[PDB]
Symmetry: D2
Subunit: 258 residues, 4 copies
């Protein structure tokens, strides 16, 4: 099977990458960074995010694996000490696949679409920032404040969490909208995070300023002459390789509790 390995690029991560490549050489595995079937990321959740976006055009063809060389990650999630064990299992094909939902972002000026694994955010570009929030064609609120964040389920433990959003098991096909410092006095928003199912479309439309900072995961991205930003749960999913039981709620506990 074709595989590739990305590294965060520190000594630890690079050496482990080389050891894994060497270990893969003892089996019928070929290093292909153009059309891999298996993408191994070595570092942290940030490195994994790069790996996802490196290979988002071939998501249906790829199984992802994350190895943390620092503290536990939500995507990266395997210990370096177990890397020798994963070489064998991967080469022997002794693994299932689990899929997490993704977020589709559409930006209309022409249209550009993006996939987020964690979230997409909209901000300005100079203070607030006024947008009309439209849900399935019906105007829901006029938001004034710092920005808005639309998160996938696995992204709920990242930015969404810091903004007060709910943590959502990634088996739920949904997206979550959170507010960043909304003004409430004109001027009224819901306050609460909102959780939308598949096929719901949330649209953001400008009121005065048309120039926004739009993020997708770690990428951002000042958008000029924007007419609309559209969110919905993607038809596409990211596939992980597993291996062993490491439940989402254990990862939450291990990351935030103890």
């Amino acid at each position: 099977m074709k595989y590739m390995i990305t590294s965060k690029g520190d000594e630890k991560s690079d050496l482990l990458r080389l050891n894994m490549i060497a270990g893969f050489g003892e089996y019928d595995m070929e290093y292909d960074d153009v059309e891999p079937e298996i993408v191994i990321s070595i570092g942290g959740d940030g490195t994994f995010l790069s790996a996802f976006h490196q290979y988002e055009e071939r998501l249906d063809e790829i199984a992802f694996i994350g190895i943390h060389t620092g503290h536990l990650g939500f995507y990266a999630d395997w210990r370096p000490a177990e890397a020798d064990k994963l070489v064998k299992l991967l080469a022997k094909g002794e693994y299932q696949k689990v899929s997490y939902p993704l977020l589709k972002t559409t930006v209309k000026y022409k249209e550009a679409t993006y996939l987020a694994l964690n979230e997409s955010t909209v901000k300005s570009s100079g203070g607030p920032f006024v947008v009309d929030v439209v849900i399935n064609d019906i105007h829901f609120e006029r938001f004034r404040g710092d920005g808005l964040c639309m998160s996938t389920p696995s992204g709920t433990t990242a930015y969404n969490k810091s903004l007060g959003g709910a943590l959502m098991h990634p088996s739920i096909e949904a997206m979550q909208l959170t507010e960043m410092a909304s003004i409430n006095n004109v001027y009224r928003t819901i306050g609460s995070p909102l959780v939308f199912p598949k096929h719901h479309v949330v649209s953001l439309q400008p009121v005065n300023d048309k120039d926004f900072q739009i993020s997708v995961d770690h990428l951002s991205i000042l958008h000029r002459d924007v007419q609309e930003i559209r969110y919905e749960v993607s038809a596409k999913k990211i596939h992980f390789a597993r291996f062993r039981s490491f439940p989402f709620w254990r990862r939450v506990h291990d990351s935030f509790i103890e």
Copy 2:
């Protein structure tokens, strides 16, 4: 078809009930409050909650309808002026059914099970209140504070909202756990609301005190010699009659925005 009508019991609600009964008399509808197929509640969301619990042993056989004689409700949701129109549609059978998820609560001392339409909460009974929170058999956190709230999707606009939880579209089969004033210093909890899918079981277990106040919707309910409280999304659903499009997000907007 067998139907019944509950009233909040003010002049407005009682008179409208009598008018509807009279209106139902012009069709082939019989008033049966023992085995109704249609349960109409006239008043507010509180009245609807009573109606649900009045008839929870026959949920699979019943379609519910809410009429608000005061301000808009989430369950009660039809205007009094449209009551004549619903008599006809109901009697002619020109309506579909929509189903919302429910919350199953199990209390072990023997076991007692309950269904919540909004939420179930656990409190003490004397300050805090220490419970071990166990998710699918694995200890997640030791909670110390005022209490905990487990909410259905349609319940997310009630108590759950006041506690900082996310608002969840009721097409999502999930439950949401929120904290009430948790101590964080011993003593660590997640803080964030947690959203669980079907088949996840959240268990609360006592640390010292075994005497809790346990609520299910408007009912509560000091429980003595408790060993465990178990939560999961129920296999059972409440069925509403509809009629016309009145989207959840419109009801949210209409209730909280304008």
Copy 3:
């Protein structure tokens, strides 16, 4: 000087109490638990709270000292290992006094007044709980929800913190009001904690139910036939003995950060 020592009553605390009494016997110090000039509390913040309320009728005459036999406390704040050192300093009189503000609570049915070192809270007694909040004679809000908390500055790190209140340096003569799960839809409150200076009077008045649970620190206290609860910063202060610099913000860091 007359002194007394309260103990949390575990082996650790009792043995240290006896050792301190023995150590005080080597100086001109007499054990008087009726009219002490120095009150030493050995245990935690909870034990200190008992000590304060044991001796609140003689606050102007007493200097308090807290020794933690477990983890660091905000009032209790000295290590057991430094107990021998405090015996000498106390007996030699090598110490200044620092004063923290207190909260006066007045309950009118006749009137009863109380002093809080941490906070006073009002709850029901059966769900919510509706009160009119009146600030300096002008109606401010109708609160509906779980309850309200009025905190002193040193109390801001306790219940007030769990409810989302600001942490306030205890050199500021102020009180802070926080909400517990307020309904916002009728029904509107400020949401934000409110910080009042000396001479501001906040009054809570019943709307329907007149039977409340009223807490003062660890004491509570179901109040029957209540007409009004009044809050203001007390003219009275608690005096601590010091000794050495242990800044409030260090105690905050040491308790909540690392």
Copy 4:
């Protein structure tokens, strides 16, 4: 007395400015926009903020007045219909002065100091944003997130409120620090807003990136090669003219409740 009048610059505000100038012409009042003793601002709180910063070099010599031509403001606070009445009172000298605390911001690369009437904020410039928070020379926390906000008491109803801070009566000489989306997992902050008294110094120091967006009220202000940002309650105060009783808590009620 020398006076000047700033206008938000819409038809309403300009016409009222001209009418007031004409009205002032009937008394011994001279229009001086260089060295006024009275600064009248006509528009909203935003216009008032401009007026304050226009004249911050002569704060000890000036009494400010705000007139709202739209909805009620916290600084602007008089109705247009009462403008004729204020002309007379001002010209007759039938008014007291009330003072609110200000925030001093010091930025060290050389030093630059600023006065804020509402708040000063620090952000990046590219995501987070890591700063060491030092309180009175002792390291308090390493903050990672979107930014930080330091607010005066009258500023607590603005940005500070949207970030979850407490509302503080402006008779209290204090400043309030709030967090914007802090990461908590490395990586720990207090969470709670912090309220500091006069003479406390809060310092922000860079960890990696030295290029910040620094705001003072409506001004911002990308700062290059920054070593430190220092906050403390200013020795200087803004003086308002009054006139009549319009209590802070009434303004809060009138702005946010009803």
